[PDB]
């Protein structure tokens, strides 16, 4: 439905708490495939399986290979703004 902008807060050493799939080499968006219980995405809320990640902290993810999205997501620090839309 609507595009949402959601903030995730975590410690440097924590993971985001999401699994992603898709990517340019598969012809599909970066899609959230799992939200892991008790981890930052689950605690903060607003991110769900089936969301496409359009951008993370202002960085466009719409034409990234899978591993490029993994890299950009893995480089996040403590505050992370997600731009997502359920597809």
């Amino acid at each position: 439905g609507p595009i949402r902008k959601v903030l995730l807060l975590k410690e440097d050493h924590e993971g985001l708490g999401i699994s992603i799939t898709g990517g340019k080499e598969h012809g599909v968006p970066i899609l959230i495939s799992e939200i892991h219980p008790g981890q930052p995405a689950d605690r903060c809320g607003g991110l769900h399986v089936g969301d496409a990640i359009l951008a993370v902290n202002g960085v466009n993810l719409r034409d990234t290979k899978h591993k490029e999205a993994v890299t950009i997501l893995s480089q996040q620090r403590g505050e992370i703004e997600f731009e997502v839309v359920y597809v």
Binding site: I18, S19, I20, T21, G23, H36, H66, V70
Partner: peptide, 9 residues
């Protein structure tokens, strides 16, 4: 193959 990568971050 056709299978998609899945990665936890």
């Amino acid at each position: 193959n056709s299978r998609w990568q899945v990665t936890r971050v």
